[PDB]
Amino acid sequence: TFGYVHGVSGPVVTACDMAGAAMYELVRVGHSELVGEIIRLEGDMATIQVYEETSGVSVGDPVLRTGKPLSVELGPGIMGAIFDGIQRPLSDISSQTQSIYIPRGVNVSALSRDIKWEFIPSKNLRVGSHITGGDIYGIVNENSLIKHKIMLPPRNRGSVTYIAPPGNYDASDVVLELEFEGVKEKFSMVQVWPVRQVRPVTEKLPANHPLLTGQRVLDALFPCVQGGTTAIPGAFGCGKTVISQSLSKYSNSDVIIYVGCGERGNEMSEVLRDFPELTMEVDGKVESIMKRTALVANTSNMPVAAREASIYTGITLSEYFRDMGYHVSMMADSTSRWAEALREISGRLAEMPADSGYPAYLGARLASFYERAGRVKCLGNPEREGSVSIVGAVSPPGGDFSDPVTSATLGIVQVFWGLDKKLAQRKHFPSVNWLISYSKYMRALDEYYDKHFTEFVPLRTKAKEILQEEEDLAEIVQLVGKASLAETDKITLEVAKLIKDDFLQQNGYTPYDRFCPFYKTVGMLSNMISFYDMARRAVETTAQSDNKITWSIIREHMGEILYKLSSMKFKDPVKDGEAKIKADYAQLLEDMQNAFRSL
Amino acid sequence: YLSQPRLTYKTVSGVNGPLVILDHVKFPRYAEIVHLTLPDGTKRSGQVLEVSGSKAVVQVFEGTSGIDAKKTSCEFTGDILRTPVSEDMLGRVFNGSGKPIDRGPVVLAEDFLDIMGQPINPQCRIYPEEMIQTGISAIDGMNSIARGQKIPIFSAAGLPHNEIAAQICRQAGLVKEENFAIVFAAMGVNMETARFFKSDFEENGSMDNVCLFLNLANDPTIERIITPRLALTTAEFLAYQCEKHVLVILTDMSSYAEALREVSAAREEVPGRRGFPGYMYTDLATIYERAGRVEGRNGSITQIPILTMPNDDITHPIPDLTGYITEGQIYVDRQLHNRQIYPPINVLPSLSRLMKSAIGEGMTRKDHADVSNQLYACYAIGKDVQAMKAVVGEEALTSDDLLYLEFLQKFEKNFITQGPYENRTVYETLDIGWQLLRIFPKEMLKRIPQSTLSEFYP
């Protein structure tokens, strides 16, 4: 049946003649079909959130009804594309319209049906077999790097009646046929899935593997794990976007979904200009990371409502690629944008506001979003195991941490990376506040180090106490000048200064520091802690001597060694073997031991 | 008892988030239970909240999704929510709504009881007196707990309150039934907490004597309103029809208050403080007044909720109103956890009603309470000296200030510092306190009575 528009106010639309309507149903509004969703019903009137711009819509326009909620489509060719807030193949749209702009009511299929793919049947599938859904039954070489694997969705079962042979096949072509209770249902390479649902899993598993990031401070102090949840609140302008981009470029994962909500398109164009050139190596084959990434951007100026659809679509795609049987992670950008969109929608609906104008159920929705991450055992008789990591970015107003958004966010996430604007103002680009950040995954990783980096475990511990003592002494420095402290205090201050200047500072744009391998980091930390140990031993041994050594004597005696310590980080990973770097660090350590022996 | 054929309607006249409005219902009953059928085969349940003329307001515990106007059906029961109750509920885990979540069957109905419970005469309550050994020097001593008391825990985000819960579970006992039956319920928590609790209980062999309710963050929030009462009804049945002593744990009441806020905002009632409904005070009074002994019977309930803290404001509405109902409160401090103290507990904000419980005549010993008070005063003065030192240099310090500081570091590093599984006898804790006291010369211990000073100081 049909509906007729009764009233309009911004991105909301009141309608009539909706007696048979159901809520969270899709609807198409106006002469130019605009996607929508139901939120509220009274009598036969209804309320509709419109994901497109609202303009030119008059009273009485047709309102077509569909019997499905919001949903997306899954299959080959998704990798490497770009999508609007709803599933829409942006590149195909620009080619189709042959125009710069995006028409308001444009309609394009999610994935082109005219692209063949080389499907191979699974070798174990015989006629008459049963798979009970959620099971791989094929494979596809959609691109050179990743092998896309077709799987029947759950809630489906039956006996096999036909399997296509290997060969080339376009989309929307029947491949598998099953017959469960005398009724034969066909299937194509493309499935569908409701957005607001959650794909079930065989089981969940505990976090047990580290997620190397390449950044020194994060990997040395507050590491994340695969399957983990992270949050990075920051003042307005701290390079959070850069942290997200660096993480995407140098993760350990296999497929990365970058969802930029409420952002400037210039970053997207920069990413498109950069990713194709940057490459990486799998099994001796070098190819661009753009193939193992997918993009979904919703520029700020776009309609406000589409932000929530963007956020949900990201997690749905990542969950599909989790069932796919890989490790993946996503860059969720500026959830506060989704919060603001929800605030506007609720305010237009005249609900009872909660703290700071945001509606009450913001926290509940954030929880429903965040729990969908973790390591899992998947459906499908061939045994599969994957994981999904969330990396949210938050931008509280005024740079304060009192607004309800961050307060709700911190109540769920397990690891927290606060960013301090003062560091950013003094060009300390990885602006991490070590004093307030905390990671709850300090456990469940000691064994990984036991089998790889056993020596590393106490080093970071010692680093933490030296920084803490520096903080406790800093105010006494501020209110009371120097020359009132023992030599141990002064040398600890110096060691903290060296730690800040070198171990913490990382410039992601330089060739020599665009990415830090772990061995480089642990070598640096070992060198610094060895220096601190030797210096403290030297001063305490001579504490009771008539020729007690002072900081000035040490500094003059081995200042060149201090320059070497500062300059050790100017080594590339490429064009420089790991053995060479380790040899240089050992040689520097030996020089330091010689300098301490000479005293 | 019996009833008549139930009524059914297809008159859904409204839908507003978690609420549904109906019309033309004959003789509605307040707080009745209903069953909803969606256009598909799914089935749900709800509860009535308002009635006027022929209008019925209901709330759906399973969230609202797929509801329409012309196809949805509703059914009307006879009475209020009455839940099954059995002694076999031990060893059985459920979800928030009480439906079995493990692979086992529906609970056999030994007896039906009212979820809301029943008021108890103040005459019939018996004052709790049996002090409890917790094996934690921080808890015992300054904040010992009698059986029947209702102390909460205060915890900011990212602090190890869960480990405190596990530690108090494993260390439950009495000063010398040999254990307690644990009725533990969780409100909107991540999978890690549930795994931790289940694994810890399984390792200690306590599945035989624990009943769990699990409400996770991904489940609809509306059932959080019912879940705590579903725990407490079972608790009080075990405490007043089996004479079994019970330690009932709740956690993260902030989510319960949030659910109340959802309902109130949906109902457009006059907000009070920070969007919380005004009568939520009475609501919390209702949910906390289910402990204490009673004559003619044996057994009791010891109520220990955990409270997640918005930011760190002690003066936030939730902690304030919980402070007016619970006799005491234990405080978890962020600074101590920053300084790597496994039980990060600040004694200063903490307080309990032990003045009549732990005395010594049959309890630990005579000098107990005096020792505790003296330690508390000494710690307060030590913190004052610490504040003084942050202003001026070390030169202005006298002998007293150095003594106080030194006492502060020793007490922080030895008394409070205590690894997990490290059960400590109460007498050992008092001996440690005496060792700390011996540092100061005997003259400055003003609170101590003279006889005790002569007896125990040397």
Partner: peptide, 13 residues
């Protein structure tokens, strides 16, 4: 103040 304005607005019906 905004909460009170809203409740009065709704009460006007």
């Amino acid at each position: 103040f905004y909460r009170l304005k809203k409740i009065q607005e709704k009460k006007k019906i």
